[PDB]
Design a protein around this ligand. Structure first.
Ligand SMILES: NC(=O)c1ccc[n+]([C@@H]2O[C@H](COP(=O)([O-])OP(=O)(O)OC[C@H]3O[C@@H](n4cnc5c(N)ncnc54)[C@H](OP(=O)(O)O)[C@@H]3O)[C@@H](O)[C@H]2O)c1
Ligand SMILES: NC(=O)c1ccc[n+]([C@@H]2O[C@H](COP(=O)([O-])OP(=O)(O)OC[C@H]3O[C@@H](n4cnc5c(N)ncnc54)[C@H](OP(=O)(O)O)[C@@H]3O)[C@@H](O)[C@H]2O)c1
Lengths: 248, 248
């Protein structure tokens, strides 16, 4: 009886907040981790929402597993209203000439291929019912050149490509496909890097015109807006959630 | 006690639906017309909301009047949470070579100067409290070249300029300034141009990849999202509400 959303992730960072936002809006939420040991955290991470959450172990780089997991969800729930491609990694080296090819391939596999696989098998099901929403997560680096994050940015540019391409292809099938482009977001990972003193908050805050960092809630709200049933006419769009970064 | 929004318009088309959207979200709404006679329509257009509506006569091309009206609103309500620059006109002729300078000037006056005047005086007040949101209405023609709508497109390009410029300028002051870029929207005006048979609905809706027209609610939802208290980190952005038009 509830709308159903699959998030690739959900246990930390943006993904966890995305899970919370959909739960607060009466969705059944499917969350994932590569690590089965995370399933037992659910009652404690999501106190009052336990009954509306389903766990799946999933590595998005494993195409067969992506197909298997999405099939399982569709069989069990009879619906897949929303896919959020949250899974993503940044292996931030130095200058381009010093970057590791192995790092690039890992980012390609997770950020591009993972998102492609999830889209590919979700759309197989969404096609059949002529409805659904996909929200991909890009970055400001997916729309601009960002020193020391060139390779990450390249993968996030590719994500925008998958978004716009699929949007135009599925537009007449009533499926909305959009992306968000976050600036620098204060996740747990970043918060502890600020807390350990190796990074000043004000130092990296200054990157955005609003002179503050983004929050996981900022991102979750944008994603929710693009995914909910009241989005009838927004598709192929990349929503900047960046305190004005891309407007300069 | 309620958040307060000024809409340049409110009696027809997109502006009326914007009015309705903010009213449903517990705002006090200031709505305008150039025509004082429209005030008497309020209990009939907005049956259950009249206690939360204030009418002001306003021509946005009159800078003096814009300053007067915004001053009166701030004096009476002690707040101005949101400005929506809805007022706008399109005077379509033929090819560029055939266009009338008087038409261009009229569109410049209403679309560019009117939006500028309202921004100018709203920001004088918002600046003082370091909070507020402005949503401007651009168009797909503000982001692309559209035969037969070149001059209109030019004004809506200029609207984006004011949007991004002011966003960066006021970003550190806690004020969010964004725009929406609608495709072709089925307003009362269009609905009768379809009803008269001078245009087929399928004919003009085919320009959007979604193969349908936008609705006034589509636009209102987008504007509300960019304007509400939960937008903390989106500024300088142009949200396309265009059935995928700009993604091709
Ligand atoms: N943080 C930022 O400032 C920022 C800025 C722009 C864009 N983004 C993007 O936003 C998204 C979320 O970022 P975040 O900072 O919230 O990440 P995070 O806190 O590091 O969390 C990463 C999430 O991705 C999952 N994941 C990683 N690799 C996976 C794989 N191969 N298969 C399945 N799941 C995988 C993780 O699950 P397990 O570890 O439990 O397996 C975890 O849920 C990413 O696409 C990221 O690139 C982040
Ligand atoms: N309809 C579309 O397909 C479309 C597409 C892209 C963008 N837009 C933009 O969306 C906005 C609304 O369009 P719409 O189609 O909803 O318009 P509409 O139905 O023609 O209504 C026009 C509104 O603008 C007001 N207005 C016009 N000139 C004014 C002036 N000089 N001073 C103060 N108010 C003035 C009118 O108020 P009174 O007549 O009561 O004075 C009315 O509220 C415009 O900026 C338009 O350019 C529309």
């Amino acid at each position: 009886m509830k709308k159903n959303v699959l998030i690739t992730g959900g246990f930390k960072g943006i993904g966890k907040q995305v899970a919370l936002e959909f739960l607060k809006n009466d969705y059944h939420v499917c969350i994932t981790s590569r690590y089965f040991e995370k399933e037992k955290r659910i009652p404690h991470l999501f106190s009052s929402y336990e009954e509306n959450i389903s766990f799946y172990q999933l590595d998005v780089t494993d195409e067969e597993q992506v197909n298997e997991i999405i099939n399982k969800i569709v069989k069990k729930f009879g619906r897949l209203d929303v896919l959020v491609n949250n899974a993503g990694i940044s292996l931030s080296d130095g200058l381009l000439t010093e970057t590791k090819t192995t790092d690039f391939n890992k980012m390609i596999n997770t950020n591009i291929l993972g998102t492609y696989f999830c889209m590919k098998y979700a759309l197989k099901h969404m096609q059949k019912v002529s409805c659904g929403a996909i929200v991909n997560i890009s970055s400001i680096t997916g729309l601009s050149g960002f020193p020391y994050s060139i390779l990450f940015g390249s993968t996030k540019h590719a994500v925008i490509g998958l978004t716009k391409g699929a949007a135009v292809e599925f537009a007449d099938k009533g499926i909305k496909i959009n992306a968000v482009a976050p600036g620098i977001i204060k996740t747990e990972t970043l918060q502890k890097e600020i807390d350990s003193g190796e990074f000043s908050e004000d130092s990296i805050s200054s990157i955005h015109p609003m002179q503050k960092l983004g929050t996981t809630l900022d991102v979750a709200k944008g994603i929710y807006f693009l995914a909910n049933e009241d989005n009838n006419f927004i598709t192929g769009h990349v929503l900047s959630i960046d305190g004005g970064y891309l407007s300069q």
